[PDB]
Amino acid sequence: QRYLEEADRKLRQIEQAYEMGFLTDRERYDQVIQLWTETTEKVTQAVFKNFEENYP
Numbered sequence: 001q002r003y004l005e006e007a008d009r010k011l012r013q014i015e016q017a018y019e020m021g022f023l024t025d026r027e028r029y030d031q032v033i034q035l036w037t038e039t040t041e042k043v044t045q046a047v048f049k050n051f052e053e054n055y056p
Contacts, residue, residue, distance in 0.1 A: 003042040007035055 017023040
């Protein structure tokens with residue numbers, strides 16, 4: 001819930017730059033493309049550890 005809604009706000013970050021010229025269409029695409037990858041890590045990292053810390 002946590003690390004995910006963080007990505008939900010971070011998307012609004014990457015979008016907020018898209019309107020400032022900072023991020024064009026292609027580089028904003030890479031920032032949002034990596035956002036879901038980092039979240040993709042933050043989740044599995046949570047899974048495994050969750051099992052080890054609670055239900056091994």
